[PDB]
Amino acid sequence: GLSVSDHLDGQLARLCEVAGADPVEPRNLLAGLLGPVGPRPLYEPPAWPSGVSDDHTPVEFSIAFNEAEPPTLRILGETLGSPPGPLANLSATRGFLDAQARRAGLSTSRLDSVRDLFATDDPQGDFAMWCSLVFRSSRRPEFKVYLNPEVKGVERSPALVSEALHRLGLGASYRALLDHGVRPGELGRGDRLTFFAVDLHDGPQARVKLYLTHHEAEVWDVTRAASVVDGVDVAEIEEFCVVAGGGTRRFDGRPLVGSYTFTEGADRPVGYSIYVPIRSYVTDDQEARDRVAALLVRYGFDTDGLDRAIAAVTPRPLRDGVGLIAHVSLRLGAPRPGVTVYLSAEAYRVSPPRPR
């Protein structure tokens, strides 16, 4: 019988061929990230309701289209404990990341400096720590850590994020977001602090990427939130949302997510990205593919790379389900702007399509 590894490793191997990447190191890191899930039978129900994907596959693929280099392949995921649970999953994922940091010779002083702010014996929200494996063309893998700002409860998330950004010397620029970028009194309610992301290795400057989930959000409000970042065109963000959402002005299905890239010596976030959960706003993956293709065409990206990446993940007819194309994002500013497409493993379930 097929294992979870057999399924996911097959997808990664074919995606590597599409991106023109040597598969040895990516496949070794995916095996490490999966931990005890890898060998489990594919027929076996998920050991944990992983928040990583709708069908609880604990990984998600993405292809980031770039202006000046070939596409970037990424894996988002977590290492389940034995047995799985909030702290057991955190411990297993941290063990994987720490071992990979030691192997690659990374310094984790920045991540280590804020680590103690997120630590709790009673972690809330079904995730504490995820990571991303990043496979840029002709480069060694890069690692990113996603921390849950709500891990000590939603009420505590603003205090936690303020303290974390300040430790990294970004205390002045965070005020700009919360003063002028959050809906009045919607902090921890309509506007949720959902991810705190760092690039595992310290690097010269303290990418923090702070992600806000805008629940039942009008694009009017999400574009106002984005305007705290210098150079962001509200018209462009609205245009991305109307095309990706298919006419939706109120995202009352799965919510819009915005990310703010915080950097040293900046008065405000330097980079902004918008993530549309397009699967919530389409009949099926043929419609999702057609909308993502339209967005790539507008931005002068080749759609053949999109189609080859879809084909690498699954041979299923795109009309036969929804949620293969889980999200599409627009990345503005430094360091590497473009469009990202998020592709579901569908290890356990294909979400049924809506009739046309």
Ligand X SMILES: N[C@@H](Cc1c[nH]c2ccccc12)C(=O)O
Look at residues 97, 81, 86 and name the one whose alpha carbon lies nearest to residue 51: 86
Residues that bind ligand X (CB under 6 A): 51-53, 60, 76, 257, 275, 277, 327, 342
Q: Considering only residues 62-121, where is the footprint of ligand 6C7 by CB under 6 A?
A: 62, 64, 74, 76
**146 touching ligand 6C7, by CB under 6 A:** yes
Residue 273 near which of ligand X, ligand 6C7, none (CB within 5-8 Å, type-dependent): ligand 6C7
How many Cα atoms sit within 13 Å of 101 on the Cβ side?
19
DSSP letter (8 states) at residue 227: T
The answer to the question of whether 98 is labelled as a binding residue is: no
Instruction: Name which of 82 and 205 has its Cβ closer to ligand 6C7.
Output: 205
**Cα 247 to chain center, whole Å?**
24
Look at residues 136, 47, 116, 53 and name the one whose alpha carbon lies nearest to residue 88: 47
Residue 291 near which of ligand 6C7, ligand X, none (CB within 5-8 Å, type-dependent): none
Instruction: Name which of 60 and 284 has its Cβ closer to ligand X.
Output: 60
Instruction: Name which of 54 and 286 has its Cβ closer to ligand 6C7.
Output: 54
SS3 86: helix
How many Cα atoms sit within 13 Å of 353 on the Cβ side?
16
In whole angstroms, how close is the CB of 27 to ligand 6C7 at the nearest point?
20
**129 touching ligand 6C7, by CB under 6 A:** no
Contact 128, 89 (CB under 8 A): yes
Contact 200, 115 (CB under 8 A): no
Instruction: Name which of 174 and 272 has its Cβ closer to ligand 6C7.
Output: 272
**144 touching ligand 6C7, by CB under 6 A:** yes
CA distance 89 to 82: 8
Burial class from Cβ neighbours inside 10 Å (0-12, 13-18, 19+) for residue 146 reads buried
Beta carbons within 10 angstroms of residue 55's beta carbon:
17
Beta carbons within 10 angstroms of residue 112's beta carbon:
10
In whole angstroms, how close is the CB of 116 to ligand X at the nearest point?
25
Bridge partner residues of 209 (DSSP): 197, 261
**Cα 246 to chain center, whole Å?**
22
Q: Determine the residue with CB nearest ligand X.
A: 275
Instruction: Name which of 207 and 291 has its Cβ closer to ligand 6C7.
Output: 207
Residue 149 near which of ligand X, ligand 6C7, none (CB within 5-8 Å, type-dependent): none
Instruction: Name which of 49 and 352 has its Cβ closer to ligand X.
Output: 49
Contact 284, 322 (CB under 8 A): yes
Instruction: Name which of 206 and 260 has its Cβ closer to ligand X.
Output: 260
Bridge partner residues of 251 (DSSP): 217
Instruction: Name which of 89 and 340 has its Cβ closer to ligand 6C7.
Output: 340
User: Which residues are CB-contacts of 276 (< 8 A; sequence separation ≥ 6)?
Assistant: 240, 241, 244, 245, 251, 256, 327, 328, 329
In whole angstroms, how close is the CB of 138 to ligand X at the nearest point?
26
**192 touching ligand 6C7, by CB under 6 A:** no
Q: Considering only residues 195-234, where is the footprint of ligand 6C7 by CB under 6 A?
A: 195, 209, 211
Residue from 11, 157, 273, 286 that binds ligand 6C7 (CB under 6 A)? 273
> Residue 245 is encoded by which pair of tokens?
């959402």
Bridge partner residues of 134 (DSSP): 74, 142
Residue from 16, 331, 338, 348 that binds ligand 6C7 (CB under 6 A)? 331
In whole angstroms, how close is the CB of 331 to ligand X at the nearest point?
12
Residue where the block lists tokens 């002083």: 109
Residue 146 near which of ligand X, ligand 6C7, none (CB within 5-8 Å, type-dependent): ligand 6C7
Q: Considering only residues 33-62, where is the footprint of ligand 6C7 by CB under 6 A?
A: 62
**What residues make contact with ligand 6C7 under the rule CB under 6 A?**
62, 64, 74, 76, 132, 144, 146, 195, 209, 211, 273, 275, 331, 340
Annotated binding-site positions for Ca(2+): 267
